[PDB]
Amino acid sequence: AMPSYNNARLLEKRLQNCDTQLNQFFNLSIKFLQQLNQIKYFYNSAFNKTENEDDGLEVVEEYENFISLVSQVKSGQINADKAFETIKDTTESRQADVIIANFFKVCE
């Protein structure tokens, strides 16, 4: 992993499963690929900025919950509004709210 605290490498292995799971979902428009790359840049960059294992674990868990929501939206289990409601209160950055809500509506 990029952070240097102990066991970050183990957390990195779960970052890559999320990135791989996103690719396998959509496996397209250039615009969608830019939004897809924006999402993966958001979570990977957020993990690389963590400085202790608790913060790195919270980002990895947040990426994993996002992956679960994408599958539920893309497979038609819930609509994009249900998905965005699930994480809007725990998402502090409003710029993250915008890209995550837009990505849910794309999958629908």
> Domain count of the chain?
1
Cα–Cα distance for residue pair 53/64, rounded to 1 Å: 16
Please indicate the experimental technique that yielded this structure.
Answer: X-ray
User: What's the domain range around 83?
Assistant: 1-108
What was the resolution (in A) of this experimentally determined structure?
A: 2.4
- Please state, in angstroms and as integers, the Cα–Cα distance from residue 90 to each residue in 16, 30, 108, following that order: 23, 30, 22
Number of continuous H segments (helices) and E segments (strands) in the chain: 5, 0
Distance of CA 38 to the CA centre of its chain: 10
Cα–Cα distance for residue pair 39/100, rounded to 1 Å: 7
Q: Residue 71 is encoded by which pair of tokens? A: 């599958």
How many residues are given for the chain?
Answer: 108
